[PDB]
UniProtKB/Swiss-Prot annotation, chains A, B:
Spans traversing the lipid bilayer: none
Protein name per UniProt: Vascular endothelial growth factor A, long form
Sorted UniProt keywords: Angiogenesis, Cytoplasm, Developmental protein, Differentiation, Disulfide bond, Endoplasmic reticulum, Extracellular matrix, Glycoprotein, Golgi apparatus, Growth factor, Heparin-binding, Mitogen, Nucleus, Secreted
Covered residues, full protein: 219 to 313 of 395
Induction: By hypoxia. Regulated by growth factors, cytokines, gonadotropins, nitric oxide, hypoglycemia and oncogenic mutations.
GO BP: any one term: positive regulation of cell division
Glycosylation sites: N63
Associated clinical condition: Microvascular complications of diabetes 1: Pathological conditions that develop in numerous tissues and organs as a consequence of diabetes mellitus. They include diabetic retinopathy, diabetic nephropathy leading to end-stage renal disease, and diabetic neuropathy. Diabetic retinopathy remains the major cause of new-onset blindness among diabetic adults. It is characterized by vascular permeability and increased tissue ischemia and angiogenesis.
Free-text tissue specificity from the UniProt record: Higher expression in pituitary tumors than the pituitary gland.
Keyword Glycoprotein: yes
Lineage, highest ranks first: Eukaryota, Metazoa, Chordata, Craniata, Vertebrata
Membership in a protein family: Belongs to the PDGF/VEGF growth factor family.
A Gene Ontology cellular-component term: cytoplasm
UniProt superkingdom: Eukaryota
SS bond list: C14-C56, C45-C90, C49-C92
C-alpha cells in the first residue's frame, strides 16, 4: 500500500488535471452578477516540474460551455451559458 | 457538449478531489532538503459551498505512504518513505 516512487513521480508531474475553479476568478470584472455554483470543474495544468525554477503552464487550450445560474441580488436569477478555458497540454517553463 | 446546470453544480460542490500538493508546504521545516517529485497527488477537500460564508473542510482524514526522493543538493540523494494526510470526507461548515 506504499506508492512506488515512479508512480508518485508520473502522477504528479506537470499535466492537465481536473481543478475546481472559482468563476469570479475567471471573470474578475463581473460586478453585476453572483454565480451558482460559484466554482466550476475545469481541466487545468497542475503538478510539478524537474526544475524548481520552472512553472507548469498551458501550451494548448480549448473552451467548454456550462449552464450557470446567474444571480442579481434582489432582482432575479437565470440559467445562462458561460464559457471557460481548459488546458489540453502543459509544459514546464520559466516563471 | 453544453454542461447542464445540475451536472456542474453536483461536480463542483465540496468533496475530496485529487490535488497536487507541494511537499514543502506539508513539511515546512524540511528546509535543508529538496524532494523529487516536489509535489504529490492527494485526495483533499476542494470545491464550493452554497453560501459564501461556508468553507469546504475535512471531517474524516487518513494517511498514505509514498516513496519520495530526498535530495541534499550537490551532495547526495536517497529514496525514502513519507506519510501524507488525505481527506476521505468533506462538508460545508461556517467559517
Amino acid at each position: 500500500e506504499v506508492v512506488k516512487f515512479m508512480d508518485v513521480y508520473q502522477r504528479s508531474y506537470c499535466h492537465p488535471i481536473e481543478t475546481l475553479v472559482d468563476i469570479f476568478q475567471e471573470y474578475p470584472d463581473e460586478i453585476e452578477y453572483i454565480f451558482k455554483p460559484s466554482c466550476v470543474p475545469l481541466m487545468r495544468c497542475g503538478g510539478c516540474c524537474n526544475d524548481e525554477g520552472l512553472e507548469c503552464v498551458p501550451t494548448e487550450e480549448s473552451n467548454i460551455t456550462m449552464q450557470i445560474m446567474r444571480i442579481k441580488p434582489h432582482q432575479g436569477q437565470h440559467i445562462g451559458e458561460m464559457s471557460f478555458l481548459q488546458h489540453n497540454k502543459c509544459e514546464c517553463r520559466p516563471k
